[PDB]
Design a protein around this ligand. Structure first.
Ligand SMILES: CC(=O)OCC1=C(C(=O)O)N2C(=O)[C@@H](NC(=O)CCCC(=O)O)[C@H]2SC1
Lengths: 520, 152
């Protein structure tokens, strides 16, 4: 997921700019985004939200707008219990479990329902589960007493001022997510939001693993106030951003650093290449227009190449295998951009899979390790060119095996297919540096692959008066069997031909294709 | 200087555009949530009802074995019951909105039974609590505390 907010001073016209760019599975039902527009005499809200939710999580209007990305807030703890004498050892004593016998119905193949027993055991920590390996684990989830999640979002997005907005967020009712803001007044903000338990010891890594469940030492009971969490407002840099990367580079120059917050809030791992492209695309550009802003969103740079090809290519050329040499020349001639016509792209990915692991996040193969001091230009180079070439030797086999040649056009193997619409693909894996994302699936018997995760709801808004906005939903606004609105946008996505979002009554009336009156 | 004059809707209606994007207009808050509920039912009704169904902790009851794991996960963490609590703890204003949303979903299914997959018809009718439950499941037991990290 990506997110950008631009201060008026960084723009040409002086109105704030906002990017909504959440990344989620294209098939998982509860992850499907829906686009809508609500209007009453007292408020207005345009935007996308997960199906089933009565509020718009990614919203905007004539006054303000927000967006969301994943920050992973560790709002829960998995304690390892020490079973003993029918109970569990705690603070030196064998304490008993809270046992509740419940039940539920299981539908049978013939349609009838069988009744099934279900015992619910609890420790002072919380519900207890048993893993396949036999380990007894108790899970303690924070914020179980925050019934106002939906209303917080509702007040947040209908806020008349940044102050009211912050007042809403302060209720600490939304358990997670990074949230970005921008309004017609000119204020932009970034927020590492969520409900985090107060702890006196242990880094985030410690709390993400099995914490000892035999001592009141690790039994937290309180949570942090909004003021204890990393936040940025109207920074000197003129913008804020987050691409699922740790909150240590929300803007450039930064306004704080890891040492200013407890070590259990966020990780301190190397920022992804896509996240690096994020900071670069914003800080390196000034006097932005909405048009230019959208253009930057389409970036599909193979940053991983820029970091490794200079060291790989030469070494691969001295290898006796003439095919390895040809592969080296193919890669070296590539403009390092994931375009439909790239004959080198596929081969490059296959190499990266081996050089940096299947998720492309591996670091052990770079010559220069990542550093928070050079956040957008590290890691760099190949540590073992010799080994790296063997990996390339293998990639050549893997590429031919998967696509039928080492030089097959990216957009010939990468397609976006919905219903009967089949169009060429572009952009790709975010971890290789592509800002616009399309996590291509494995290829079928014929080397054809499609997006499994990636771009979904994409909008860019300029808070002018009246506001101007464009957007697109990769998988349409409906998934009901037989709808004409499932694959009728994918064609425009393939060309980055965005729809102008309609908020004004006149506009809406001009494009209406169906009126549905109703009474409540 | 000042935001353009807000529109004052003088009647309830959804104006759909060429891409299936609903523009809900309500004379008041509850009306708008009802329209929203109706719109979402029209566009994703099947999956919404299925998800709401699981949120009640009845996935295994309604659709069998392939939903039993989730059922157990949500029951042991008492999500469906906490959902009833959270629903009751809502403010009177917002609870009215939530109720309207569920009513909208119900209304659409009532006027268009043919657009509802047989298998999820048993979920109807839905309630504000169902809306709350699903949200609670999504936020706390999918995003924050996933069954994966607790089980392996
Ligand atoms: C296992 C567990 O607890 O993780 C669950 C989980 C998954 C996952 O891997 O299932 N994620 C995705 O697919 C990513 N979502 C985003 O980047 C969008 C964030 C913003 C939004 O969704 O509005 C993260 S969000 C949480």
């Amino acid at each position: 997921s990506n997110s950008w907010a631009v201060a008026p001073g960084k723009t040409a016209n002086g109105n704030a700019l906002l990017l909504q760019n959440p990344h989620l599975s294209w098939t998982t039902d509860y992850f499907t985004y829906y686009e809508a527009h609500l209007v009453t005499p007292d408020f207005e809200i345009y935007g996308a939200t997960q199906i089933g939710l009565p509020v718009i999580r990614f919203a905007f209007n004539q006054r303000m707008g927000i967006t969301n990305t994943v920050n992973g807030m560790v709002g829960a703890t998995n304690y390892r219990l020490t079973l003993q004498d029918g109970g569990y050892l705690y603070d030196g004593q064998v304490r008993p479990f809270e046992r509740r016998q419940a039940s539920y119905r299981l539908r049978q193949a013939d349609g009838s329902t069988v009744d099934k027993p279900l015992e619910i055991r609890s420790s002072v920590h919380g519900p207890v589960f048993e893993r396949a390996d036999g380990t007894a684990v108790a899970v303690r989830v924070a914020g179980l007493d925050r019934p106002g999640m939906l209303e917080q979002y509702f007040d947040m997005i209908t806020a008349h001022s940044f102050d009211d907005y912050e007042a809403a967020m302060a209720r600490m009712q939304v358990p997670t997510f990074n949230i970005v803001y921008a309004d017609r007044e000119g204020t932009i903000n970034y927020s590492f939001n969520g409900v985090a338990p107060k702890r006196a010891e242990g880094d985030i890594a410690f709390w993400q693993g099995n914490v000892p469940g035999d001592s009141s030492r690790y039994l937290w009971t309180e949570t942090h106030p909004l003021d204890d969490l990393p936040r940025v407002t109207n920074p000197p840099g003129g913008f804020v951003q987050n691409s699922n990367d740790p909150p240590w580079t929300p803007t450039w120059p930064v306004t704080y650093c890891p040492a200013n917050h407890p070590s259990y809030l966020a990780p301190q791992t190397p920022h992804s290449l896509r996240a690096q492209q994020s900071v670069r695309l914003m800080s390196e550009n000034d006097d932005l227009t909405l048009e230019r802003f959208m253009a930057l969103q389409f970036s599909h740079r193979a940053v991983m190449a820029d970091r490794t090809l200079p060291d790989l290519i030469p070494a691969a050329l001295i290898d006796p295998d003439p095919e390895v040499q040809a592969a080296a020349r193919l890669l070296a001639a590539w403009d390092r951009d994931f375009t439909s016509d790239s004959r080198a792209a596929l081969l490059f990915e296959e190499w990266a899979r081996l050089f940096a692991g299947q998720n492309f996040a591996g670091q052990a193969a770079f010559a220069t390790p990542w550093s928070l001091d050079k956040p957008v230009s590290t890691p760099y180079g190949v540590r073992d060119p010799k080994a790296a070439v063997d990996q390339l030797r293998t990639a050549i086999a893997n590429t031919k095996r998967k696509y039928g040649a080492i030089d097959r056009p990216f957009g010939d193997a990468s397609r976006m297919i919905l219903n009967d619409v089949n169009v060429p693909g572009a952009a790709g894996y975010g971890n290789l540096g592509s800002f616009r994302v399309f996590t291509w699936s494995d290829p079928d018997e014929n080397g054809i692959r499609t997006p499994v995760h990636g771009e979904t709801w994409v909008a860019m808004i300029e808070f002018s008066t009246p506001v101007r906005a464009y957007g697109l939903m990769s998988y349409g606004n409906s998934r009901q069997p037989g709808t004409t609105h499932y694959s009728d946008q994918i064609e425009r996505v393939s060309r980055a031909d965005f729809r102008e979002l309609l908020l004004r009554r006149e506009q809406v009336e001009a494009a209406v294709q169906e009126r549905t009156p109703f009474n409540f | 200087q000042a935001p353009i004059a807000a529109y004052k809707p003088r009647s309830n209606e959804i104006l759909w555009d060429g891409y299936g994007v609903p523009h809900i207009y309500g004379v008041d808050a509850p009306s708008a949530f009802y329209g929203y509920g109706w719109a979402q039912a029209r566009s994703h009704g099947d999956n919404i009802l299925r998800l709401y169904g699981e949120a009640r902790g009845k996935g295994a009851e309604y659709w069998g074995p392939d939903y039993e794991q989730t059922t157990v996960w949500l029951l042991t963490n008492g999500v469906p019951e906490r959902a009833q609590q959270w629903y009751a703890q809502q403010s009177p204003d917002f609870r009215a909105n939530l109720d309207a949303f569920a009513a909208g979903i119900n209304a659409y299914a009532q006027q268009n039974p043919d657009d509802i997959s047989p298998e999820v018809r048993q979920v109807l009718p839905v309630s504000g609590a169902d809306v709350v439950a699903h949200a609670h499941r999504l936020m706390n037991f999918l995003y924050v505390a996933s069954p994966g990290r607790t089980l392996g």
